Structures are given as structure tokens and as C-alpha cells.
Amino acid sequence: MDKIKQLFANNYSWAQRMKEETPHYLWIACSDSRVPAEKLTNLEPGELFVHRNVANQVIHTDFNCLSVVQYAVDVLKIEHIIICGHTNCGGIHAAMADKDLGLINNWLLHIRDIWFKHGHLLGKLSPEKRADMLTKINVAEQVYNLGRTSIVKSAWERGQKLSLHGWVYDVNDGFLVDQGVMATSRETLEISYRNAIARLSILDEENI
Amino acid sequence: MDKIKQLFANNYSWAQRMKEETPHYLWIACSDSRVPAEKLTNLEPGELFVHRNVANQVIHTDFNCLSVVQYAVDVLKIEHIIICGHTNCGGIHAAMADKDLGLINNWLLHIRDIWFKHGHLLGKLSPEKRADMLTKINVAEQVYNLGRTSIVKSAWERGQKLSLHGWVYDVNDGFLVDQGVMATSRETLEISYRNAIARLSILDEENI
Amino acid sequence: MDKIKQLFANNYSWAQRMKEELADHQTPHYLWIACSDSRVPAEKLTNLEPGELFVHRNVANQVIHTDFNCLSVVQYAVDVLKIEHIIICGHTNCGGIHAAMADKDLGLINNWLLHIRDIWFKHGHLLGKLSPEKRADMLTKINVAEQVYNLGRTSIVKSAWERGQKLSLHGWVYDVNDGFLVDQGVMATSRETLEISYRNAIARLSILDEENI
Amino acid sequence: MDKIKQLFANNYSWAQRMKEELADHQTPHYLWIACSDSRVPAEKLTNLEPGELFVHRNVANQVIHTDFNCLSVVQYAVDVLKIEHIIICGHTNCGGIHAAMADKDLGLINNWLLHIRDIWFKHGHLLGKLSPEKRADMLTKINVAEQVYNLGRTSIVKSAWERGQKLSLHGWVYDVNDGFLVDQGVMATSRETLEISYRNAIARLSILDEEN
Ligand SMILES: [Zn+2]
Ligand SMILES: [Zn+2]
Ligand SMILES: [Zn+2]
Ligand SMILES: [Zn+2]
């Protein structure tokens, strides 16, 4: 192992070079995302409370992610939760491949369920565009799952200001693109989710 | 919603400025650590595969983290997993506080079990230093847990090259500090864990 | 307190009776995944010999993709105990199904039951074609079919099949008023037979008797 | 395959018999958390009226702090069904305890059982004083004590107590050779009684008869 030594070297050089010269958002992103949230958003370290998992999921009964959410909402009183996906997501491609990759396959079955849920849409899409579309639909679905948590519903019910957001950044331009699901209440969840799916389901003439 | 608008402005300006101008590590870090791993390690982007949760835990039965680990080891063939803690960890402080914070308290009970495991040590330490020591002990314990997973044990059993590391990022100097648990095998895990705890139990003349 | 004291008295009485008036069946041959409501016990339903059932019970008998607890029961049952039959058993008048369908925030359990609500959505057209007082029991039946489908898609079961291990998956429901086990159609000995039977089962359930419309 | 066909014939036979020869107990009054081994069924052990038990079973009857499955059963039982008694029941000759104690990689289940191994090491001094053939049954007992302790530290149970809701936690073990439920000593109606009873139970288990 030389890569560990290289990492210590780079950390030392960075820290030295730098010295020579209340979080407000919960950010839920993917483990294989290339650009850190803070870089994408030009925020100061500490501004974001960050959870990262494979393919940026909010699975209904994932104690890990739900714990981060409950802590953020009920304890940190964070007012904004952002789910950020990205193009060329290895998690998404892994979910779409037909290989048993072992335990991770069970995690990615939730994504496969989303694929089936939108099977009519994705079936009408030319196969090479399907990954990008799934990546976007996934973000929309994860915001919907987040807004359906007991944690978020309760926060809203008691009058706590809390907004949910779902974006995708394209590795080809670094722009965050809103996928259209934005919730500040259960009604705005339902409406913007339906709206967003309808919009995502309009395919360019690369159909069937 | 101004904070969200600001984020889109920063992102746009960032990506414009930027244009006009195989992961090798699994990095398991804390959701409330402030400096991102990518910056701190000053590596090539995409070099890190990142999981972040509250208090950088590898819980034996956490599907989320174990999935990341299995994926990283069995599929990505990553050779280095690093658990990184950090000083002034809100997760650790939360674990040590006697408040019911709701669901997150269940997540942090694993940390409290670690505190009890090392209760004699921590009790001999002045109260204002205990959070600091628990944070370090926690990293050693999480590396131990990681090395005890079926995934890591199997990887080693079949002769796959895989190392586990446990560091703490020090905010006051930006340096990664090795906590001394470094495992390339079950035997090196046992020894370096025992070695690490023994070293961490030497308290500065600030006893009782 | 009196309920507990009475429980010990019931137990002591039964155990002592047994004495002055299981070990041969060390390894169970069936895994029974069922609901925590435990209306009619599996033993009563099946009249199997003592020890033959390995049992997991959770709210509304779910096999959630990423549930470490259930997946652990399944993996141990299949890879360690070498069980060749897994049965998912639902039941009518299921409190979990009823809670899942109710709008109330019951707290933590709502998150567990969101998986059943997803299933409800997944078959919303069909369930909307049913009379209101028939919907819970249709959702109970559909739930069981979906859980067999989930079980058969686990890495655990698929790997068992892929390496030639004999394993069958079953999904039944009984009416709590009569105790007759009814097969819901999803029965898998392979990924192919899972696909076919799952598809056929949903198609069959979508052909509504006019009583239920 | 014949086993299944037989099972349906048994069922039809029993159900048919019943017809030509539960609904009054729609809400159970006990939560029974026990092992998937299900050696002597809870109904047989307790002789309760049909429907009185709400049952969760998993390998080696664990209450893991972050297990959504068990915690969901517990929260539904406490907050929704308003159950006032939760019982954790272990049993001798537990395959999960035996698997926990063995060094074999059995795959995924090993991760679930790492929690039992943590308990094994937590009480490593005690368990080393026992004769090898007595260790599994001692770990079974300690396991139950520790799971009651975990249950009583859940946010679900602490909140129930905090708000004044009547709730008791129990931890029993039965010998598969005789069916007598034996109380392992951790019994909590409050956080304070949880602590005292937990400490007392471990102390009592630490006082060894003959078997060294
Ligand atoms: Zn990704
Ligand atoms: Zn932290
Ligand atoms: Zn039920
Ligand atoms: Zn057992």
C-alpha cells in the first residue's frame, strides 16, 4: 500500500498550504458522487449536514438515513433537506445490470422497484437514455419517500418550517438541475410529485 | 427560501468560474464533520467512495453501511477502507448527553455501549476531555466492527488485499491523526485493536 | 402484576402436569414468515410435529428488501438449516394491513407500513374496482403475493437457487373466521417460476368475482 | 413436494373438523419477543386465550438498538395496541446462541449474531468460569437479561414511561427439556427499576453453583 502514504502526504501538504494562506441544510447524496456538495454549492464547511449512501436513497425503514433525518429535523432544526443525485451514477447502473453483486443487490432492489413503477415510461425510452432517466426519476421518488416519513409529516403537522428538494447535477456541466419535486407540506409533496413525474414522462422524439 | 436561491446562484457562479479557468478508498465519515474528505485528502476527484452517517458508525446490522462495504470490497475491489472521525463531533456529544432526542438516540446507543465498554478508562478522565477520548475510542471500535463483518473476514479469507484504517481529523490543524488500528488480516486486527486501546488508555497527568 | 402472575401460574401448572403425567425434531423443515398478530398459531393451522417450524413474525408479514432481521432469518434458514420450504402466511382482519390503509400517524410503525402503502398504490386501479369493505382482505392477499416476490428476489434465495439448492417459496392467507389456508398463487422453485407465478397470481387476482365489485 | 401437500391436508382436516364440531380477543395484552427456533410455542407455555399474544421472533431473540423490524413491533405494541407487558423469552439449546458461539462463517447471519458475541465478551470473565458444556445455557440467560436492558433503553419504551404509560418489561428463559418459564431477574416498570434489576440480575448470574 502506497496510496495510504500518498493520502497522508496530500493531507499534510494541503493543511500546510492552507495555513500559509450551525448547519442549515441536510444534504442527501450518493456515495460515488464525484464533486462534494460544498464544492458544488460554494458553501463553507459546516453549512451542510451530509448523509451519503449508494444511489442517494431514502428507504422507508433504513434506520441509518432516517436517524440522520430525525436528528436534522427535530434536533438541529434544519429547514431544508436536499436530495442530490448525479449522472453517471454507478449505483444506478449497478441497479440496472442483471448481475448478482451480492448483498448490495438487496439495497438496489428499491431502485429496481422504481424502474418497474415507471416501466411503461422507461420501456418507451431508447435503452441508452434509460440510465439518465432513472437517475432523475430516482431523485423524485426519494423526495416522495422523504416527505412520507413520520419524521417529516410530524414536523409539518406541528407547524415546523421544512422544505424538501430533489436535484441532479450533471457531471458534464456542474449545474444543479431541479427535478421538480419540492415540498413544504404534504399537499405540496403530493402535487409537485405528480407534476414532476408527469413532466419527466414527456420524452423527446427518441421514443420506442 | 432565500438559502435555496443562494445555493443555485453559488452553484451557477462556481460552475462558470470553473469552466472559464476508479475509486481506491472507501471513506466512512461523520455526517456532522465539516471539512469534506475530498478536500482534506486533496485527492483526484472520484478517488473516494464515501459513506457518511452520524458518528461514523459501522453497526453490525446496519444494512446501509454494510451494503456500501460489500459493494466497495466485492464489486469495486477497493483495497483500503478508512473510518474517519473528527473532533467536536455533535454525534458523540449527543451520545454522551442525557437528553431524549427521539429516534437518533437509538442510533447513538451503540456509542453509549462503547462508552460503557471503556467506562473505567473514561471515568478516570476529567469530564471535559471525555468527549475527545470517546471520539478516538469510537474510531478504533468502528474499525474493529468493520474487521468483524462477514464481508471483510471473507475478503481476507479468500486472499483479497484489503486494509482498514481508523483516523481522526483534527480541525485545529487539519491533520489526519492515526488512532493505531490498522488491519490487513484478522490477526492484525486483533493485535492492532488491543494495541490501540492500550495506547489510548495512557492518560496525560489529568487523571480522576 | 396479575396478568403476569397468572401467566406463570398457567405455565407452572402445565409444565408440572406434563412431568408427573420435541428433542427428536432438532432441525425444522419449514420457515414460516407471518404476522405478529398471531391470530391462529402456525402450529394449530398446520398440526406439524413439535420443533418443525422455524418462525419469523413481523407487522403484516413483510419481506422488506433491506430488512436485516428478516433477511437474517431467511439466510440462516436456507444456508445453515438447509430448509427447503419458506411459507409467507397472511391473515384476514390484519391490524397491520388496516393501519397501513388508515390515514392516521401512528408514529414509527407508519414507516414500516409505507411498504404496504406502496403495494396499495401499485395495485390502486384493481383495489379501486372493489367494494370498500372487501379492500383490506384484497390488500392482504396482494401483500402476500408481493412478499413472496420480494423473498424470491433476495440475494439469499437467488444464490441458493443458482447453486442448485432445493428451495420452494409459498404464500398463503387464512380467513381468521375459519382457519382454512388458501394459496395465493405465487409459488417459486426458481427465478423463472417466480416470475411466471407472480405475474399469473396478480393476473388471477385481477379477475374479480361480482360479489367483490 | 409432499411436505407441503401434507401440510394443506392437515390444515383442511383440522379446519373442517372444527367447523362441523378468537374474535372476542381482538387486541392482545402481551408482546412476546422470542427466538425463531420456536421450540415450545408461546401458546403452549402460557396457556393464554387465543389472540392475547402479539409475537415477534428473530434469531436468538434480540432487541438490537437499531433494528427497524423489532423496534416497529415494539412501538406499534406500546403506542398503538397499548400493550402493558413485553416479555422477552429465551430458551435452552438455542441454535442462535450455539451459532453465535461457534467460530464458523455462516454468512449474513454472522453479522446479526455479532451482537451476541459482544455480550459474550462483555461477560467474558463470568463465562470463562463455567464448565464449557454449561456456557451456552449461561449465554442464553445473559442474552435475555441484556435484551430486556436494550428494550428498556429504546426511545420507544423510555418515552412511554416518561409520559406515565403503564408498561412492564420481562425476560424469561425455559429449558426445552421441561417447559418451566424461569425469570432471569430483569424486570422494569421504569428506567430506575430497569437499572437496578439489570444490575441485580447480572450479579445473581455471577454467583455460580457447582458448575465450574
Ligand atoms: Zn452515484
Ligand atoms: Zn461528527
Ligand atoms: Zn396481521
Ligand atoms: Zn433459539
- Compute CA distances A84 → A53, B21, B26, whole Å: 11, 25, 20
Contacts of B62 in chain D (CB under 8 A): 66
D60 CA → ligand 4 middle, Å: 5
Contacts of D72 in chain A (CB under 8 A): 61
Cross-chain CB nearest to A53 (options B39, B42, B51): B51
What region, left, alpha or beta, does residue B177 occupy, with left being phi > 0 and alpha being psi -120 to 50 degrees? beta
Quote the minimal CA–CA distance from C68 to chain A in Å. Answer: 10
Neighbours of chain A (3+ CB pairs under 8 A): B, C, D
Which of A59, A62, A63 to mutate to probe the D interface, most D CBs <10 Å? A63
Give the whole-angstrom CA distance, residue A193 versus residue B7. 22
Could B61 and D108 be called an inter-chain contact, meaning their C-beta atoms sit closer than 8 Å?
Answer: no
Contacts of D69 in chain A (CB under 8 A): 61
Cross-chain CB nearest to B63 (options A18, A51, A107): A107
Provide the grid cell at A5.
502514504
C155 CA → ligand 1 middle, Å: 21
Could D43 and C39 be called an inter-chain contact, meaning their C-beta atoms sit closer than 8 Å?
Answer: no
Is residue A102 within 8 Å of residue C155, measured between CB atoms? yes
Paired sense of beta strands A176-183 and A163-169, if any:
antiparallel
Provide the grid cell at C210.
361480482
Give the whole-angstrom CA distance, residue B64 versus residue A109. 13
Buried b (16+ CB within 10 A) or exposed e, D131-153: eeebbbbbbbbbbbbbbbbbbbb
Nearest 5°: phi and psi at D49?
Answer: -65, 150
A30 is in an annotated binding site: yes
Neighbours of chain D (3+ CB pairs under 8 A): A, B, C
Could A61 and D68 be called an inter-chain contact, meaning their C-beta atoms sit closer than 8 Å?
Answer: yes
Is residue C60 within 8 Å of residue C97, measured between CB atoms? yes
Q: Which residues surround ligand 1, an ion (CB under 5 A)?
A: A 30, 32, 89, 91
D68 CA → ligand 4 middle, Å: 21
Which CATH superfamily does the domain covering B1-208 fall into?
Carbonic anhydrase (3.40.1050.10)
Provide the grid cell at B131.
468527549
Contacts of B149 in chain D (CB under 8 A): 111
> What does the angle CA D138 – CA D144 – CA D150 come to, to the nearest 5 degrees?
135
Give the whole-angstrom CA distance, residue B180 versus residue B6. 42
Q: What method did the depositors use to determine the structure?
A: X-ray
A49 CA → ligand 2 middle, Å: 10
Cross-chain CB nearest to D107 (options C54, C75, C179): C75
Strand partners, C111: none
Neighbours of chain C (3+ CB pairs under 8 A): A, B, D
C37 is in an annotated binding site: yes
- Compute CA distances C76 → A97, C60, C146, D106, whole Å: 27, 21, 22, 8
CATH class of the domain comprising D1-212: alpha beta
Neighbouring residues of C38: CB distance < 8 A, sequence distance ≥ 6: C57, D28, D51, D53, D54, D55
Buried b (16+ CB within 10 A) or exposed e, A141-180: bbbbbbbbbbbbbbbbeeeeebbbbbbbbeeeebbbeebb
Which of B2, B32, B81, B101 to mutate to probe the A interface, most A CBs <10 Å? B32
D91 is in an annotated binding site: yes
Query: CB D203: neighbour CB atoms within 10 A?
Result: 10
Quote the minimal CA–CA distance from A11 to chain C in Å. Answer: 36
Nearest CA to D181 among D210, D141, D149, D142?
D141
Cross-chain CB nearest to A150 (options C111, C118, C154): C111
Residues of C with CB under 8 A from a CB of B: 66-69, 72, 108
Query: CB C197: neighbour CB atoms within 10 A?
Result: 23
Q: Among B51, B65, B84, B89, which one carries the catalytic annotation? A: B89
3-state secondary structure chain A: CCHHHHHHHHHHHHHHHHHHCCCCEEEEEECCCCCCHHHHCCCCCCCEEEEEECCCCCCCCCHHHHHHHHHHHHHCCCCEEEEEEECCCHHHHHHHCCCCCCCHHHHHHHHHHHHHHCHHHHHCECHHHHHHHHHHHHHHHHHHHHHHCHHHHHHHHCCCCCEEEEEEECCCCCCEEEEEEEECCHHHHHHHHHHHHHHHCCCCCCEC
Q: Which residues surround ligand 4, an ion (CB under 5 A)?
A: D 35, 37, 94, 96
Domain boundaries, chain B: 1-208
Give the whole-angstrom CA distance, residue B143 versus residue B140. 5
Binding-site residues of B for Zn(2+), please?
Answer: 30, 32, 86, 89
Could B51 and A31 be called an inter-chain contact, meaning their C-beta atoms sit closer than 8 Å?
Answer: yes
Cross-chain CB nearest to A38 (options B32, B36, B50): B36
Place of cell 421441561: D178
C35 is in an annotated binding site: yes
Quote the minimal CA–CA distance from A182 to chain B in Å. Answer: 11
Provide the grid cell at A94.
449497478
Residue C132 buriedness (CB in 10 A; 0-12 / 13-18 / 19+): exposed
Nearest 5°: phi and psi at D185?
Answer: 105, -15
Nearest 5°: phi and psi at C90?
Answer: -100, 180
Could B117 and D115 be called an inter-chain contact, meaning their C-beta atoms sit closer than 8 Å?
Answer: no
Q: Tell me which ligand sits closest to the C-alpha of residue A171.
A: 1
Q: Tell me which ligand sits closest to the C-alpha of residue C173.
A: 3
Contacts of D3 in chain C (CB under 8 A): 29-30, 84-85
Q: Is B6 helix (H, G, I), strand (E, B) or coil?
A: helix
Contacts of D10 in chain C (CB under 8 A): 46-48
Is residue A107 within 8 Å of residue B67, measured between CB atoms? yes
Catalytic residue set of A: 30, 32, 34, 86, 89
> Does the C1-213 domain belong in CATH 3.40.1160.10?
no
Catalytic residue flag (residue B24): no
Q: Among D67, D70, D94, D123, which one carries the catalytic annotation? A: D94
Is residue A154 within 8 Å of residue C105, measured between CB atoms? yes
